Amino acid sequence: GANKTVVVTTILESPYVMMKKNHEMLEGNERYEGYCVDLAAEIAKHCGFKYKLTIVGDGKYGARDADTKIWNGMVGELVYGKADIAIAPLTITLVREEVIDFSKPFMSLGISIMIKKGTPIESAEDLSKQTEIAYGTLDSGSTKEFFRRSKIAVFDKMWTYMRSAEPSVFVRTTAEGVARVRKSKGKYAYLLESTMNEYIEQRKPCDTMKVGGNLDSKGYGIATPKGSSLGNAVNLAVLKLNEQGLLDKLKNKWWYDKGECG
Amino acid sequence: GANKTVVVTTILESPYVMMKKNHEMLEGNERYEGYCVDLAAEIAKHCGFKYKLTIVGDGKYGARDADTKIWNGMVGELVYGKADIAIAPLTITLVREEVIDFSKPFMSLGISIMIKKGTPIESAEDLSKQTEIAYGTLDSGSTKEFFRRSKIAVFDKMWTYMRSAEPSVFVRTTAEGVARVRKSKGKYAYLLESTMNEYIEQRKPCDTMKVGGNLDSKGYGIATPKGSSLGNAVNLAVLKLNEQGLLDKLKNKWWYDKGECG
Ligand SMILES: N[C@@H](CC(=O)O)C(=O)O
Ligand SMILES: N[C@@H](CC(=O)O)C(=O)O
Ligand SMILES: [Cl-]
Ligand SMILES: [Cl-]
Ligand SMILES: [Li+]
Ligand SMILES: [Li+]
């Protein structure tokens, strides 16, 4: 029953986990910085464990293949026994809750629209009623699944377009989506979680923005393999850190103190 | 192992649970209406149980006495075996999570400031720096505990004032707090959760408003006695109802379709 170093799976997603510019000079956990790097240190301190940060091998959040039923991404790392905990912007969803355990949420968010500044779109309804401006989502995460499973008219219409659009409107990483918005001269809009959208709006070159309200409301949770004894302590730590204002401090540190757009 | 009617504890708090105007003509669950009445019906349908709504006897959310260590309110009803589930705007907190089980949250909120229109206050900092305008909170809930336990300078200053203020700035129910704001000619401001503040701002006589940002961020959860077998199904139902847009529909029904202030 010896104490064992906890293997943490996480994902390179700004400002949650980022490679320090000089990462090749550094070793181990010191290579990384961000909101989730700081949160991992706090959770570990409050739960009394030592840990090793690892970046998910496939760069994905996690989805299940319809035919093989195999989970990929961080969810897969937990499900198949490769990691002990995921500390990442991992959205709590019904399908995931059935296969992994989640803390109460450490951050709230909703799906939102990113545009290149000046794009004549203000809402999901606006996007759904036109095709000149292409729009899409990240693969292998909760946002794509939201559209695929929606029975709400506007979102069904959006999914109906996205699933058949040529060329593909889907991207492998948030960075790819943002690059496509920036390089498409207003002819691509990107659907992504409000947290990431709000961060990117305050980073140079300051050419994107969030428009409209959020399309839904949900949260990120710290995930553990189903039935793991670590889950109880981690959940209490999230609640304690929230109540002591630490999560709000980290939000301010990594979003608004990081603002470059004045 | 016979199916047993589930006893639901809840609280009279608008627009979550309200007595219908003609309640004396009605019996049982039909006496009540509101967001949590609708949510209870949906949760029960998705979990396959029958239920009886009961209003918490002491009219309280739930706190533990420092000396006797006895829990009151809805929390007490669960802890001492008087109810099987609480379906109410019951805030998920560390101290409660240790004694009862909670679903993932069904609604997000934060502590907020209610003023009578025209009161010269825009922030918690503003309140903390003066005493002409008295301010307080509800007894026996999470908002009072937030201030009592805060180590954040502005909130500690506020608690330092509130705890010794004469006459008392604390109230037994939200309705009492709102009445005091309305009747105090701008000389009382009330600290309460944003959800309730936003509802009341859209009800006649349309003389109150929310000012400033929220002071914190947290959620309401459906609560069960610790270890209850019902908790798993209830949690999945909350997630499913969120994902299918039902919670958003209920929010719109009970807040904005209920708007009387045009
Ligand atoms: N945070 C999301 C990523 C997305 O799909 O927007 C997830 O957990 O899958
Ligand atoms: N909803 C809160 C009430 C409050 O204190 O504002 C609770 O659960 O205690
Ligand atoms: Cl948040
Ligand atoms: Cl919400
Ligand atoms: Li939601
Ligand atoms: Li928070």
Please give the full DSSP string across A47-104, using - where no structure is assigned.
HT--EEEEE-TT-----B-TTT--B-HHHHHHHTTS-SEE-SS-B--HHHHTTEEEPS
B217 vs A146: CB contact, 8 Å cut-off? no
A236 vs B92: CB contact, 8 Å cut-off? no
Experimental method: X-ray
List the one residue out of A18, A20, A21, A2 whose CA is nearest residue A10.
A18
Q: Residue A146 has which token pair?
A: 């939201």
- Contact (CB, 8 A) for B78 and B96: no
Length of chain A: 262
How many CA atoms, within 13 angstroms, populate the side-chain half-sphere of residue B136?
Answer: 26
Neighbour count for residue B174 (Cβ, 10 Å): 23
Give B248's contacts in chain A (Cβ within 8 Å).
216-217
List the one residue out of B203, B228, B193, B206 whose CA is nearest residue B84.
B228
Amino acid type, A151: K
Determine the residue of A35, A90, A159 to mutate for testing ligand 1's pocket, defined as the one with the most ligand atoms within 8 A of the Cβ atom. Answer: A90
Q: Residue B243: which of A93, A105, A245 has the nearest Cβ?
A: A93
CA of A106 to the centre of ligand 6 (A): 7
Q: In three state form, how does the secondary structure of A201-228 look? A: HCCCCCCEEEECCCCCCEEECCEEECCC
Helix residue ranges per DSSP H, B99-229: 124-128, 142-149, 153-164, 174-183, 194-201
A64 is in an annotated binding site: no
CB-based contacts of A13-18 (< 8 A; 24+ apart in sequence)? A13/A88, A13/A89, A13/A174, A13/A196, A14/A174, A14/A175, A14/A196, A14/A199, A14/A200, A14/A203, A15/A199, A15/A254, A15/A255, A15/A258, A16/A88, A16/A89, A16/A254, A17/A53, A17/A55, A17/A88
- Separation of alpha carbons B117 and B185, rounded Å: 9
CA of B71 to the centre of ligand 5 (A): 30
Helix residue ranges per DSSP H, chain B: 35-47, 73-79, 94-97, 124-128, 142-149, 153-164, 174-183, 194-201, 230-243, 246-251
- Contact (CB, 8 A) for A85 and A230: yes
Neighbour count for residue B96 (Cβ, 10 Å): 26
Element (H, E) at A197: helix A194-201
Q: What domains can be seen in chain A, in order of their start residue?
A: 1-109+219-258 (3.40.190.10), 110-218 (3.40.190.10)
Task: Report residue B237 CA to chain centroid gap.
Answer: 21
- Separation of alpha carbons B72 and B64, rounded Å: 6
Is the CB–ligand 2 distance for residue B17 below 6 Å?
Answer: no
- Contact (CB, 8 A) for B181 and B169: no
A98 vs B243: CB contact, 8 Å cut-off? no
- Separation of alpha carbons A106 and A218, rounded Å: 11
Is the CB–ligand 2 distance for residue B141 below 6 Å?
Answer: yes
Q: Identify how many contiguous H helices and E strands chain A contains and give both numbers.
A: 10, 13
Give A94's contacts in chain B (Cβ within 8 Å).
236, 239-240, 243
* β-strand partners of A71: A64
Treating both helix axes as pointing N-terminal to C-terminal, what angle do B230-243 and B35-47 enclose, rounded to 10 degrees? Answer: 120
Give chain B's contact residues with A (Cβ, < 8 Å).
Answer: 92-94, 97-98, 102, 104-105, 108, 146, 149-152, 216-219, 221, 235-236, 239-240, 242-245, 247-248
Nearest residue of chain A to residue B106 (CA atoms): A218
- The set of residues, in sequence order, having a beta carbon less than 8 Å from that of B4 and lying 6+ positions away, is none
- Separation of alpha carbons A164 and B97, rounded Å: 46
Q: Closest ligand 1 atom to the C-alpha of A143?
A: 5
CA of A144 to the centre of ligand 1 (A): 8
CB–CB contacts below 8 A, A to B: 70
What DSSP character marks residue B31? Answer: G
B185-224 burial: b if 16+ Cβ within 10 Å, else e: eeebbbbbbbbbbbbbbbbeeebbbbbeebbbbbbbbbbb
Element (H, E) at B136: strand B134-136
Q: Residue B188 has which token pair?
A: 């009382």
CA distances from A257 to A205, A253, A254 (A): 17, 5, 6
Q: Residue B151: which of A149, A239, A244 has the nearest Cβ?
A: A244
- The set of residues, in sequence order, having a beta carbon less than 8 Å from that of A120 and lying 6+ positions away, is A126, A186
Q: Closest ligand 2 atom to the C-alpha of B143?
A: 5
- Contact (CB, 8 A) for A75 and A62: yes
Cis before A89 (ω within 30): no
The dihedrals phi and psi of A34, each to the nearest 5 degrees, come to: 140, 180
